[PDB]
């Protein structure tokens, strides 16, 4: 019974790990996109002088 319970718990842990990996990718991508979307328009406008 303990082995079955641990297997179910490990399934939950695996789901959490997969969600963590997706969110790592999403949050790094969002950091890059926010940094660009805030500043790059004005920076390219100034560089085109």
């Amino acid at each position: 019974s303990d082995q079955e319970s641990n297997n179910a718990a490990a399934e939950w842990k695996y789901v959490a790990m997969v969600m963590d990996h997706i969110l790592l990718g999403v949050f790094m991508l969002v950091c890059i996109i926010g940094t660009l979307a805030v500043f790059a328009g004005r920076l390219i406008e100034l560089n085109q002088q």
Binding site: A10, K13, Y14, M17
Partner: protein
């Protein structure tokens, strides 16, 4: 002023960057150390390297 960066500011930004890199390093080391058979597979290449 903005003609140059003061030494104090340069040093503080440098140590902040070093601290950020070491935080990333600690996160990576913890990710590697707490891997268990029930979630992660045994990479033989990394094991042979390290």
């Amino acid at each position: 002023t903005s003609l140059s960066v003061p030494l104090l500011g340069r040093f503080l930004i440098f140590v902040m960057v070093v601290a950020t890199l070491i935080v990333m390093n600690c996160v990576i080391v913890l990710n590697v150390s707490q891997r268990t058979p029930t979630t992660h597979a045994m990479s033989p290449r990394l094991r042979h390297v390290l």
